[PDB]
Amino acid sequence: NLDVICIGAAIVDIPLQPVSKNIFDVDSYPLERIAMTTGGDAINEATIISRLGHRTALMSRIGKDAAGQFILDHCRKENIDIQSLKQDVSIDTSINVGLVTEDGERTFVTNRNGSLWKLNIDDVDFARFSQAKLLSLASIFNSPLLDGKALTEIFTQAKARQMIICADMIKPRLNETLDDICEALSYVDYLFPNFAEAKLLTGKETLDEIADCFLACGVKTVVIKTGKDGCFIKRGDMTMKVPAVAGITAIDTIGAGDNFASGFIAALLEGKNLRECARFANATAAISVLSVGATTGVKNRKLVEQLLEEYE
Amino acid sequence: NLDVICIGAAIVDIPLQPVSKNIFDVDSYPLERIAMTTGGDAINEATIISRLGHRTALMSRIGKDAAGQFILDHCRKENIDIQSLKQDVSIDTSINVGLVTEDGERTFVTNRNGSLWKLNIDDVDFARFSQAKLLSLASIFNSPLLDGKALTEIFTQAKARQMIICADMIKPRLNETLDDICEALSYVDYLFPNFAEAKLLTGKETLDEIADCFLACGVKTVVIKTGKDGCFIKRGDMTMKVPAVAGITAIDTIGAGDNFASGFIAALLEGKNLRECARFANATAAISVLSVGATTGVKNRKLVEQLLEEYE
Ligand SMILES: Nc1ncnc2c1ncn2[C@@H]1O[C@H](COP(=O)(O)OP(=O)(O)O)[C@@H](O)[C@H]1O
Numbered sequence: 187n188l189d190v191i192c193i194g195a196a197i198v199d200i201p202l203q204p205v206s207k208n209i210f211d212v213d214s215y216p217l218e219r220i221a222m223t224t225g226g227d228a229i230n231e232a233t234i235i236s237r238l239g240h241r242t243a244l245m246s247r248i249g250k251d252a253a254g255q256f257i258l259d260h261c262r263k264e265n266i267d268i269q270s271l272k273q274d275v276s277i278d279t280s281i282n283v284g285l286v287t288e289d290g291e292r293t294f295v296t297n298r299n300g301s302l303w304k305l306n307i308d309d310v311d312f313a314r315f316s317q318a319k320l321l322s323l324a325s326i327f328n329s330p331l332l333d334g335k336a337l338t339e340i341f342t343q344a345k346a347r348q349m350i351i352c353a354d355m356i357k358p359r360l361n362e363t364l365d366d367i368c369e370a371l372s373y374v375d376y377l378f379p380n381f382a383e384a385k386l387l388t389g390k391e392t393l394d395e396i397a398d399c400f401l402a403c404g405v406k407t408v409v410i411k412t413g414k415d416g417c418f419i420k421r422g423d424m425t426m427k428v429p430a431v432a433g434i435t436a437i438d439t440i441g442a443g444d445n446f447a448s449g450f451i452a453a454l455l456e457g458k459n460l461r462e463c464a465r466f467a468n469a470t471a472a473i474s475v476l477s478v479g480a481t482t483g484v485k486n487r488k489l490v491e492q493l494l495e496e497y498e
Numbered sequence: 499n500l501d502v503i504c505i506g507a508a509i510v511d512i513p514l515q516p517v518s519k520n521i522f523d524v525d526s527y528p529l530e531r532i533a534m535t536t537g538g539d540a541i542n543e544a545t546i547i548s549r550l551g552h553r554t555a556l557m558s559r560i561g562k563d564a565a566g567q568f569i570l571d572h573c574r575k576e577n578i579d580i581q582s583l584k585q586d587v588s589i590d591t592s593i594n595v596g597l598v599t600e601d602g603e604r605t606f607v608t609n610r611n612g613s614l615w616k617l618n619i620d621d622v623d624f625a626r627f628s629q630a631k632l633l634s635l636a637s638i639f640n641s642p643l644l645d646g647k648a649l650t651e652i653f654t655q656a657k658a659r660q661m662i663i664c665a666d667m668i669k670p671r672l673n674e675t676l677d678d679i680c681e682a683l684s685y686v687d688y689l690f691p692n693f694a695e696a697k698l699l700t701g702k703e704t705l706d707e708i709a710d711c712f713l714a715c716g717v718k719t720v721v722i723k724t725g726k727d728g729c730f731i732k733r734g735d736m737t738m739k740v741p742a743v744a745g746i747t748a749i750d751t752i753g754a755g756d757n758f759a760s761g762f763i764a765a766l767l768e769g770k771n772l773r774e775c776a777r778f779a780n781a782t783a784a785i786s787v788l789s790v791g792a793t794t795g796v797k798n799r800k801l802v803e804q805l806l807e808e809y810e
């Protein structure tokens with residue numbers, strides 16, 4: 187009954203909005219509310235995929251603390267399988283405090299030593315791999331210790347067991363290059379790069395050229411997210427552009443990529459053709475940019491399906 | 499077995515240091531650590547009084563959330579009785595985010611709707627008052643709903659059971675004046691105002707003057723904390739100054755007042771005379787200003803007693 191296993195760091199965000207740009211001008215900021223929220227690509231994806239109707243399991247490692255507890259409770263409420271989401275007293279669950287000014291300005295205070303940086307291949311339980319159909323690596327480069335060699339092993343274990351392999355990416359944190367992951371990429375079935383970051387990573391400027399760098403490493407299908415323009419897909423010699431949902435005015439696109447990937451994976455598991463998977467992903471992502479927060483918009487599934495009847 | 503009942507708001511803190519004065523512009527601050535800490539006058543006192551060898555119970559109300567559970571974990575660990583520390587599903591446990599600059603500056607982002615603001619007389623269980631000897635109101639004015647009328651009621655209940663009533667203070671949050679709590683003050687045996695804040699509240703400049711406004715309301719003993727100068731004590735005409743522990747460098751005075759009151763209360767329960775109660779309070783407070791954090795310095799009684807020999 188398990189369709190997806192998502193691997194990545196589960197973390198907690200604490201948004202502080204809105205604060206003055208000259209924060210120390212005053213002594214205190216009595217906000218309307220201060221509360222934790224689950225964040226991180228892995229959490230967002232497992233959460234959205236689950237709401238879309240596909241049973242998911244999250245593999246990660248958090249601390250034995252209040253933030254870790256909040257994550258587990260979130261997963262229990264979303265019906266995310268948490269058997270492989272272990273707690274460790276030796277670490278602190280990463281907590282990202284995001285400050286925002288009553289004008290738009292943003293900044294983030296993070297824990298350079300949080301659980302996000304501690305995640306490694308040891309937190310991956312291969313025995314469970316035969317229980318799901320698809321593996322989603324919620325962000326290559328996100329957790330540095332999960333480098334090329336680790337991913338190659340993770341993906342190698344996934345491929346025995348015949349799983350479909352999906353992966354998103356973020357900008358490298360430790361100067362890594364495409365070189366560092368080219369071998370790991372040869373095992374990937376669907377890669378979901380972000381245009382700007384993919385451009386910076388490959389050093390190429392056009393969608394075709396950027397996509398070719400990944401395909402040359404062995405990736406089967408490349409799905410580049412182009413924000414307002416939807417997405418660009420390339421497999422073998424075939425390319426296809428799929429326009430974003432029309433008319434939408436984005437509040438904020440935080441987590442838009444995660445929602446996109448989730449919608450795509452859902453369509454994939456349901457056997458839709460490549461264009462249909464792209465439209466479902468664009469529709470899911472579109473709904474999420476209309477609300478503040480990564481997982482606010484996509485509350486269920488009906489919402490996405492309704493937007494689909496109105497894609498134009 | 500139960501020696502003290504402390505009443506106040508139990509909260510959690512997330513200290514962020516060090517951040518830029520010009521916090522925005524950057525996008526990131528990878529700190530060495532971001533972790534929760536229990537905080538609040540009531541929690542700090544219950545904690546230190548417990549480490550000093552006296553059993554304490556904390557009366558409060560927090561949210562039935564992750565933060566709340568964290569406070570309950572801290573209490574159990576410190577052997578603080580949490581029978582009267584209720585969890586409420588409808589409220590969010592207050593979380594204070596503290597920002598500190600590399601060179602001094604401090605600001606706090608708070609939750610104007612937090613549990614701290616919700617505390618009221620209904621959260622006080624008068625039935626247990628017969629189980630303890632001393633009542634400690636961890637800060638008049640801290641929780642607005644506990645105004646002069648409520649305190650009068652609480653203190654009347656405490657006095658009918660012959661408890662010793664101690665009270666600490668903070669600066670009024672909603673423009674309350676000394677007249678708003680003068681009737682309540684007539685039930686207090688020991689009041690611990692901070693010098694600067696007492697000056698603002700009473701409108702006086704002299705310790706003798708300040709102490710006098712409180713004595714006028716019926717307070718038995720006034721113990722004004724004067725930082726590096728130790729403390730000033732005054733009773734019906736009788737006045738006394740007690741020098742602080744000399745030679746104390748002083749790293750930070752966060753929670754120094756809570757430590758002072760805890761040491762004073764411990765000495766009172768041990769039957770010490772007024773002067774040595776002050777010495778013990780000054781000694782406990784001294785140890786706390788040497789370490790960063792409110793309850794970091796005073797880990798055990800022996801640490802204070804050692805410092806006590808050579809108080810000079
Ligand atoms: N303004 C928008 N209108 C419609 N869909 C959008 C919009 N912005 C983002 N999306 C959806 O989110 C997906 C991911 O967006 P992303 O590439 O990260 O955009 P950005 O760089 O603007 O943050 C897109 O492929 C699209 O489906």
Ligand SMILES: Nc1ncnc2c1ncn2[C@@H]1O[C@H](COP(=O)(O)OP(=O)(O)O)[C@@H](O)[C@H]1O
Binds near residue numbers: 728746781
């Ligand atoms: N520099 C110091 N040296 C010795 N004891 C100190 C010092 N600073 C504070 N204390 C202790 O803490 C108690 C309360 O401190 P308080 O007056 O509130 O300090 P502050 O004004 O720095 O907040 C004092 O009465 C004293 O016992």
Ligand code: NA
Binds near residue numbers: 443
């Ligand atoms: Na995005």
Ligand code: NA
Binds near residue numbers: 755
């Ligand atoms: Na103090």
